[PDB]
Design a binder for this molecule. Structure first.
Ligand code: FMN
Ligand code: FMN
Ligand code: NA
Ligand code: NA
Lengths: 150, 150
């Protein structure tokens, strides 16, 4: 399958600082079988150029361990009247200090739409966040991912 | 443990129609071990009066089955600068047609706060939604839950 078109458009590209962005719930499963979440943004989510796969860069330690243990993940993405629910299977990964760069195949996509306009989770980017989430290293890892995938 | 105070305040009460409300990501795990999500609101989430436990009413079929299979769940709740991540263990349930009324113990709470103001997922209630999610039956089930818990 592929990254759904509307989701590729929601995630593609990287924000500058001081800009309103959607926070995407990035889901995993912990060792007791409980669902687990982290917030990611366009900075840590990028489709491949052909949209076949979804790349992610994850800093949060428990999410990273969950991915290493089960290889399963999911995403919530909000766009207009649609809540997109994704399920993701990790097919490869690359570690760089506290960051895990991941390649995901989409294994399921549900368009959850009741005809009711939705607002996404939102936050404003900042120079502090750029430091907390190590944007320079995330960017580098995404280019390493792009290069290896191709 | 108990329902965290800030989360009890976010969930308590029931909205009328045509009102802006937060949509809470309600998480489960499916049969292949993938995280799974549904959107719920204050209409389908209510703390016990003593805040010891969290009641929920779930209509979405796969979420309901996931709960029946694993008894695990989670929640995302947004409040100011804090993203609240909850993990939930189902301790009892009651079925009424297509609805599953659930009692959850909180097994974990993480306050995820980077000092960056957050906007929750939002939607406006409506008479159609009241019908789609069967508010009269949800309300009844919550009173049945309150009664049995006490
Ligand atoms: C606005 C905001 C942005 C965040 N961005 C990221 C991010 O890009 N990468 C990340 O790993 N965690 C990020 N987080 C933090 C995760 O949501 C948080 O660490 C979560 O509890 C997951 O941590 P854990 O997997 O170690 O439990 C962000 C949090 C907020 C509030
Ligand atoms: C605005 C909005 C409100 C919703 N409210 C509810 C709800 O109260 N209860 C519910 O079970 N599903 C609700 N949903 C639908 C779930 O998010 C959706 O069915 C999801 O795909 C879970 O279905 P599944 O568990 O069968 O896969 C809502 C969807 C939207 C867009
Ligand atoms: Na991106
Ligand atoms: Na409520």
């Amino acid at each position: 399958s592929k990254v759904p078109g509307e989701i590729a458009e929601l995630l593609r590209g990287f924000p500058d600082v001081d800009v309103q962005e959607q926070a995407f719930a990035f889901l995993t499963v912990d060792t007791g079988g409980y669902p687990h979440s982290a917030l990611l943004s366009r900075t840590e989510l990028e489709p491949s150029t052909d949209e076949a796969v979804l790349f992610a860069v994850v800093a949060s330690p428990r999410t990273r361990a969950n991915l290493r243990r089960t290889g399963t993940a999911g995403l919530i993405a909000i766009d207009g009247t649609t809540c997109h629910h994704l399920k993701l299977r990790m097919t490869g990964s690359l570690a760089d200090r506290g960051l895990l760069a991941c390649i995901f195949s989409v294994v399921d996509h549900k368009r959850d739409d009741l005809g009711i306009p939705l607002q996404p989770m939102l936050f404003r980017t900042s120079a502090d966040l750029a430091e907390q989430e190590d944007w320079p290293r995330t960017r580098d890892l995404f280019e390493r991912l792009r290069a290896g995938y191709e």
